[PDB]
């Protein structure tokens, strides 16, 4: 048993969206519930709808905003949110509320919703190489800076996931309608510049996949 | 307390008593951890006790069968059987909340049945684990030589699920269960089970679930209790079903229905909200015995509920209540000292009184079988009093043959001749009034000084408020005489909304101008009429349908019949104040004599009032003691 | 709306020790559920119906409680047990979640490994110039960083981001970025990224000069 939800969403304030939550490993009749997860706001219960019955329990806080539906032949539940606002920007999860005291055991993977007026913007990817000086040794740290992009997320890897350990990718920060993110990789002293180290930034929202290779800083 | 003369035995003894546990066609005598949910009945001379046999643990969600013990010698000796067994499907398979009806020599037992759910039934998201079963026992009596020998053949249980609707007025259903304990056969022969029911919003509520055909088929009355009323017990009283409900964390709600539960009406004028679940009415509720019986030729009700001083679900101090649906008397405590004792069942058979109730230590539950000797003593004594005063009053031949009889319908309390140093005694022995500065006179008291008066407690009765009816309707009647002219405006009689007597619902005062000050609620007071010092006057306060009246010598005062209850909120009357405020806190000095205070739970009609007025010389209890 | 109060907000626990989280209902309920939440994943069910252990959850997790007050206990905590924990009732409508308690792991003092990076020549090719400072794998959580251009403390244009506690070594790490215009940045020679932390008496300083 599993729950599979719909893709990433980006919408202008005031529109509508309809999320899906269909389960493979199909079981027969059950409650599927919805949870809003926002940073700073823990988890908020939206409502449940009963696959193969139709019954719904709405949380009154969401009376205007939410309308739940379910196509019980394909066994999929749909949550639809009307007249959106940045308030509604969150990760939305669905899960099955087991009959025996209604606990949520099987959860969805989550559907991330972004409600913004702001333009989609491909990031600039900059290489952060050590300062000209000594490079004293015993290990060396390199950086990749991902500036001015919208919306979240971007995905960052080093040597296409080959350099797994010694990475610190940081959460992004918001600044006048665009994000900036940085990652640090630390490697053994002898393994750079001798070997190639590249960060691979992908921003799906802008369909962009840039690859900055970190080169040692040159003459001024 | 258990009465003097009363006694008991540990009949279903926790971790001791054994039962015929049948599984896969083999029976074994098995020890039971805890016994709960008692129901004690009489089937054609055979005492039968039914309960939960909880085999391993006390938990509601565990392995449970339904045990039955029966005696042919008024409880001296018993045979033991399992009446209904569970599915054996898992370690939590259980048949729960057995609820019993006796008709003829048949025992109808109604149980919930679960297979493997680990959560409490009300929190379930659907009915997948649930069935509702009806099993019937046939009771038989043989007599070899001198010796009476009974046997009870139990039927295989039958599912009543097909009678459970998908929808009840504007909500969808989930599950339902019996109210536990003992249900009834209506005087029309219907089997009536008050049942607890959940909707999809997981709210619980009570309905009437009945059979017109000896339990072949079942119907639900259209109406219901308010939400959160659970574990309902019902009895039939003057053609109506009276449904008495558990409401956790609130005062017990009671309803009437004349139409097999199609319309439910809250019994505000009698028993609803009388009984609190705990001193502060802020704890879990309980299962209650609630039976109609005829004792000493009087038709009465017996109610039990733990006072639960301990709080949470401990439910110590099991109490017995006696009511004629007018007066409510606390017979007293049935459990022994501070022991935990929640659920109870009271049987009255062949003029002897018995109780089967829980005792709980550390969540290990036994059932005791108590011979309530002393309790009957008191009950019989109280009834005698009730019969006698009522008789005394109807017996009075009133002024111009004889005029109309003095009314005793809805007569709840009477304060007359008998009084102690600090108390004015209710003739009907239910609620006394306390007094200060009271000097005893014929049929009442002479008060004087600051803080003078008598207080008849209403909300101030505390955990159980027998006079709660007065918030909806009452008549308060008294004879009065003023001995000194007041320096302001002093109180005589009234219903107080606050504990000082400042805020009144309805009352009477008298002023320095020799006038009456009838006080209707918060209305600016307009003095009217006139009184003279030392003359005796007849005072009547009536309140019904949020309207109050004041009558002097049987005539309504000018400005009488105004609204005293402004919003559509219900009042919450603190007390009745008589002959002063009985607060040293209030500055007034009422110097008056009050005689024969009567309290009725309805508005008196013009004639009943007028009778009382002419009869004021002959209602007193003085002669008769 | 039974409100669920989880106190306190943040709790610390030493590796291998037990800790208990509480959940205090505004009104009585039949039972509690508990979930673990680490951002990026979904919530994970830990205990259902008050005390039963969800499948695949390690039995270090225990559930107790009754009526109005319930408890979640970790027998002996793991590095990876740093997370958010939520209690949950669905015994009366509407279903409600706990206010949430965050678990922090207590470990020994670790000093930050500070590395400072000048702006890339490509960033300089467009208007800007951002100086980045990485302070990695340190403990305790509390640190703060000051930027010094030629020994004077620059205030504005500094933007910081910190990682969650490590699920392996239970240390924290932080990025600090001072962003300027190209010319502003080029007016001064010496760039210092200076952090006071418990582990050092005098502030941990990493600097560079454009003289190279
Ligand atoms: Na079994």
Numbering used by the authors:
A (entry chain H): 2 to 27, 29 to 222
B (entry chain A): 0 to 399, 409 to 633
C (entry chain L): 1 to 212
Passage from the reporting paper:
This family of nine-carbon carbohydrates, is actually scavenged from the host's glycoconjugates, through a glycosyl-transfer reaction mediated by trans-sialidase (TS), a modified sialidase expressed by the parasite. TS is involved in host cell invasion and parasite survival in the bloodstream. We now report the identification and detailed characterization of a neutralizing mouse monoclonal antibody (mAb 13G9), recognizing T. cruzi TS with high specificity and subnanomolar affinity.
The crystal structure of the mAb 13G9 antigen-binding fragment in complex with the globular region of T. cruzi TS was determined, revealing detailed molecular insights of the inhibition mechanism. Indeed, three binary Fab-TS complexes are located in the asymmetric unit, all very similar at the level of precision of our data. Given the overall structural similarity among the three complexes and the fact that complex IC1 resulted in a model with lower B factors, subsequent analyses will be referred only to this complex. Figure 3 shows the immunocomplex IC1 highlighting that the variable regions of the Fab light chain are interacting with TS loops located closer to the entrance of the enzyme's catalytic pocket, while the heavy chain associates to an adjacent, more distal patch. The epitope consists of residues H171, Y248, R311–W312, and loops 199–201 (KKK) and 116–128 (SRSYWTSHGDARD - W120 and A126 do not interact directly). The most readily observable feature is the steric hindrance that TS residue Y119 imposes, blocking the entrance of the sialyl residue in the reactional pocket. The free mobility of the phenolic side chain of Y119 is limited by the juxtaposed residue S30 from the Fab's light chain. Not occluding the enzyme's catalytic site, the antibody performs a subtle action by inhibiting the movement of an assisting tyrosine (Y119), whose mobility is known to play a key role in the trans-glycosidase mechanism.
